[model samples]
Target chain A: SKVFIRSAINRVHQNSAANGGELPRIVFPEGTSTKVLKALATLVEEKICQPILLGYPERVKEKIKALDIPLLNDVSIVHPSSHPKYFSFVEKLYSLRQRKGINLGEAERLMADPNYFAAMMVNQGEADGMVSGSSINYADAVRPILQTIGVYKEGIPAGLNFVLLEDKFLVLADTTVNLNPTAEQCAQIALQAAKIVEYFGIEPRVAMLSYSNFSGAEGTPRKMKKAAEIARSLRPDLMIEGDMQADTAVNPEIMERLFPFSGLKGGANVLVFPNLESSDIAYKLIQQIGKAEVIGPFLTGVRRSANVLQRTTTVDGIVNSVVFTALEAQYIKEVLKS
Target chain B: SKVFIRSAINRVHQNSAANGGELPRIVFPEGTSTKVLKALATLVEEKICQPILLGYPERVKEKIKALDIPLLNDVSIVHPSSHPKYFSFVEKLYSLRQRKGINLGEAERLMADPNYFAAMMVNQGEADGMVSGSSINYADAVRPILQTIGVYKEGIPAGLNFVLLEDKFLVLADTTVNLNPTAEQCAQIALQAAKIVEYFGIEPRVAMLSYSNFSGAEGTPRKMKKAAEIARSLRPDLMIEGDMQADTAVNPEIMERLFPFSGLKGGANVLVFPNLESSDIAYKLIQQIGKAEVIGPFLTGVRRSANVLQRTTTVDGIVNSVVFTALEAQYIKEVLKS
Candidate 1:
């Protein structure tokens, strides 16, 4: 898995340089954690991103020194309690949550939380993206971002994991978010997945996967069928087809023999699962049964780039997430132009 | 895929002889189909089974002649309308369908259909098993068997397919029956699948597959969880676990890392699907993505062994199904004692 991360990082660097030579600033909310500090050090040393660390100033400094990490002067540190933009970030948070009955005092208290403060920075354009969930729960890490930075203009926020097979790369979406999404939301997730695949320079051939293949069986929900229809109608330019079985979606020979009328010319590179369960299960199955390596349940369709790592995520996983977040931010800014 | 079929044939022959010195009788209803004739001819030449062909005697002889097939005198041919047992079969059919308002005239007419007649032979102990559906609808081939021979005492009738990977074989269940199995039905299907695996001389570590892993996701149907629980309670001796994702079920390393408490010690050999859609899609995907051979959608849980072939089935496929059905019948008679 880590081996594939290096390739992703290289691609990100090349893609970033190709776009504008501008390094996206990525904020680490849980900067005091050992893994986060190590990942940030790597990112900074490689010049992959301009990493902004958010924590208590003295604690961050001590941890950095204790870990023997050489943080260049360009590395920015923001103390949530005393930063120059503290009041402004608090004010922005207050406004964002004001309709939800959050008062000024509650807003100020929320800003003191490092995750919230980091998300506020991204929301305020002080940083291009934010990465957290190392020492915190995923829901807690992502809640602040969802409340502030929010979803992309065109799509819903969805999780997309890249499964690297021995000979190919496959992307699975909404494995971590959108439990039992409706047809409309499923379509949005597919679009979001397509955008990310395109960002990676792969021509996106999206398969809206279901247990059923082209209505071949009974008891399949109409959700997958409607989702496929919605996705195709919404993005005619994208090579998309479904409610297909995983085999028909990924196997070109099967696709050609069984479903020659399908829109996907070769086979699917991007698989949009009907819901989190199927997506999560399918990807995990691919890893074990196909002997493939997995990368990212990288969060996509955010207003700006943001990612939530699993609690048991390794240091290499954090580093890979950072590179991916940076690359996504840059791609959305330059290529997608949203 | 045919390579696995050949291996399976060899295994079936060895196992059949080991259990019963006599070859099982397999009745072919669609004896006029080219593929059926070819498969029957092969079985006769190999002494794999005593094949009983049911059709019009003249048409059967002419087709055999047209295909340049050498039929041994040992190969038995029965004409539906003029056989000595035709009236007896009609009487049996009338008894089975009398409550459903079928009369003797209708029973006689039904027996005229070769598929029904062959099924009646299995029902009356004239043949050990029956195979059809080479040139007819699957419902037509299977309906008479389901109506007459019925299911095994311990389980409901279900479909099981073996996906033969390079190193091992995987059994997937309910790919051809049970549209949406309840938890109890799912359990029965698992039991049937396990029996089939055991019949093939493979230890069955059954995995009740779902999108959710140990309740990792919300909104997963209670059916899979309930099914796993029921299967465990019903068959405590069997190595079974469920509500597991495909990866955790198949990959021992992933299982050890993520779900060490799983009952399937060696990972799953038999996968009981929640519904027909997933099973059908998964097996097809396995065939293409895993680059493995498929040996079934072999029907299980019937009192007398019977199989329904796909309409597009090849001659080799028919031969393999014949061997499997024969092996299943012998195994049930000797090993299962049901």
Candidate 2:
């Protein structure tokens, strides 16, 4: 309740690249309904952010007019059945497939499916970024994106990264994916979370959590040793520590005393939970009990910036998430330039 | 460091009963150094509780004289080598054994072993309980007692129980024992934990934890759900919920809102973790992060109230544990009578 007013509303003004600029465009897939169309219209008119509504244009426009929110005059609208770009985009999107009898009608039908359509939009540069997960769960939202964009490497799993900032940002990874991570999975998650942190203009100090510290104990120490060992082998330049707890990972005093051997002590700007249950429970606990405002369960290892929100998210939550996603797109775009 | 002072000194006054009180007597197997012996002597002099010292009598007396601690004439001392009662106690304790041709000499040799002697003392009424883990690892300390006492039942495996509060205790069966618990093992753990809570003053509400709360989210959740179903079929009177996160397990508000169908809402006192990794890490989190004083690693589903302590434990921790074991013993005695 307090979060929307505190971070979400104020973040748009703070993040504007130019004076009174038209905000970065974000596409919402299931935009045929009146409630969501109205929310999108209000968001564009208020100049909080620009939105491109995707679905049946007639259905969305009727709902927008009925809801009495002013639709942006210059806003680009796309309906798969009538749009001129739909046929060409579908053909190019599925160029690898050699279906002999696949006509315009079948291509349009495939283009209208949410996952395929969303992934095609991202692949074709239709919109700057996209957000979903109100009408679909996480798996359904990301399946198309992964199918089209593909993973970054041979063994890298699709994981979600979170950037937390009460005042300063701390990125965390695999909070929504990978139940029990091996050392390699953990390493990839850390690297992705690090890139996200760097995208947010924050130095990344990733801490891999375990019950032991520095491999000092017997069996309890091996996991941390393995995680750190893998991370070091993969990225020799990244700041990281493994086999640490939440307190030892975040607090400077505890870090100094507990882990005199670690460089990231008191300085971990990113945290990787051991498994999905721990990641989910820890983040939920922070939100529920510690009262922290969380961002994406955001998609990492995707070719484009596609994000998903929690099912119980607000309009302001949507606005803030798109800004974060836009910033990620900006980083990925810059990285590609080099 | 602060704990050591509290444990080593500042002895609390106890009102001892003439019949040696209802509380269990604790046997110290061999820490009879000058400093430790002095502490034991002080405990006996104040009549805080029964302190049974097991060692060579002459050596113990010599150490007591050297330490200048006033050893009470009433202190019970047993020598394994030459004591009249030792062989009889050993025979009675092991009469149901399968190993044949185990002669009196061989038996006497095993009886002279500290583990054998300590376990026998608890089995008989010689000592109400025993605490040994200082010189041995957890398995070595526990195996002897388990061999002598066996488990609670054929189906029930060894599990660890921890009391979160006076009326709130959780038993995580196979956390310290099983590597990967089967569905049947999970059910047995649930039942065993329920029995433990019932043995204590509280009503048992067992939660079998998983990565998901509902909807059969993963393979583990399926196992958890199956376990819950099995537990319900076997003991319908027990309150149990499974395939859940920690928040869903403990928080009544979450339970009511998320799983309105759950029967164990607002009253889950016993939490059975899915595996050792989660169980051990979660309890450590609660201790270090949640700021709850821990009372276990208490061995549950045993034939009797036999338990051990961590090697790096305070005397106060040992004392409190003895009290807890005594409560369980008393409860078992009461239940058998009923």
The TM-scores that each candidate's chain B achieves against the reference are 0.92, 0.79
Model 1 compared with the native: what TM-score? 0.84
For candidate 2 chain A, the 10 contiguous residues with the lowest summed lDDT are A283-292
Residue B172 lDDT, candidate 1, scale 0-100: 83
lDDT by residue for model 2 (B1-338), tens: 23422432222222133223544576767645443464455455443446667788888777777766665444677777666778786675457453655665667677787777878877776766676665556677787787776676645545474634434444555546664677788888778777766654567788877768765765888888888888899999888888777667767877886578987767467777666545655554445433345556767667766667655455655655555455555555555567
DockQ of 2: 0.21
Q: Cα RMSD (Å) between model 2 and the true structure?
A: 6.0
lDDT of 1: 0.78
Count of residue pairs whose backbone atoms collide, per candidate: 3, 0
DockQ of 1: 0.35
Best-fitting candidate, measured by lDDT? 1
- State which candidate has the highest TM-score: 1
